[PDB]
Design a protein around this ligand. Sequence first.
Ligand code: HEM
Ligand code: 1MJ
Length: 289
Amino acid sequence: LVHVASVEKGRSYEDFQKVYNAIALKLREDDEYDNYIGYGPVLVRLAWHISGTWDKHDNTGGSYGGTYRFKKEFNDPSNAGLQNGFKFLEPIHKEFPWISSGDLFSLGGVTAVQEMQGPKIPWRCGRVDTPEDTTPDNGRLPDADKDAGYVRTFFQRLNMNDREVVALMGAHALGKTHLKNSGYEGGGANNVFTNEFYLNLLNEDWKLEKNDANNEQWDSKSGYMMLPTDYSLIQDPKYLSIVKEYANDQDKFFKDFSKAFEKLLENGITFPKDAPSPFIFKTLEEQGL
Ligand code: HEM
Ligand SMILES: O=Cc1cnc2cc[nH]c2c1
């Protein structure tokens, strides 16, 4: 399976910056969502889940086809809660009907990260909607109740190594878990992108507890929580070294996350040699907007 990036006809950087801006302005406007967390975290999760279906072996899944728009994927139990992100993006897609679904979902994630003061994430356009029969089956997204060995093996399917996995997981600084969504509850409720995931892992006094859904999760008195898969990053000595690195170097985390997140969003896509270079969008703040 080959998916060649095809730039939306006649579109250039300015077009996608307009879309970025519309997303960012709405992020600013709809500030009440999820007890004032806002839509930032759920948009990042959405971009990851539409990408995380990829299988390097046969190039099925991936962000390219925008298949989350189809009920099989939309209704994946692993995607519970993401409908909020999709609804957020609906009016953006109405305003810019020319953008592909894959481009919109992935751009939503990039916009969210940047607007939440995260690293710049270069982003390339050209994903093309594919038919409903190309929607990957449920069950390609990761379980949270597993250990480091599971996480490592899982991410090999997405062609991610230890450093890429540890960097990507830093997105768990964002937002919170919702019992009704995932069977996990609580967390920092933050909407600012920092390396705090790693500092929390290393610095909090974690207690393995059972939540109201009868699932185990690690909790701190400060009110933070870690999934078993999160906590596995300090149980595995190779992961632990990287956690310590990011806990002690904000810039390095930002740079590595940016690369890994772009890679994640671009897995499965062939970019022609004469495709535009990746765009780096200005934040609203950089634009004085
Ligand atoms: C082993 C890998 C992973 C597991 C098991 C996992 C699992 C979860 C679970 C269970 C939640 C709670 C969802 C809810 O109840 O609302 C969550 C939230 C979230 N995840 Fe992950 N995740 C993983 C990797 C990632 C990656 C790679 C990213 C992005 C790079 C990411 C981004 C997020 C974000 C931003 C949230 C907060 C969503 C919100 O606040 O609504 N996760 N994750
Ligand atoms: O409190 C830390 C925290 C916040 N959000 C998430 C999401 C998954 N794991 C998390 C942990």
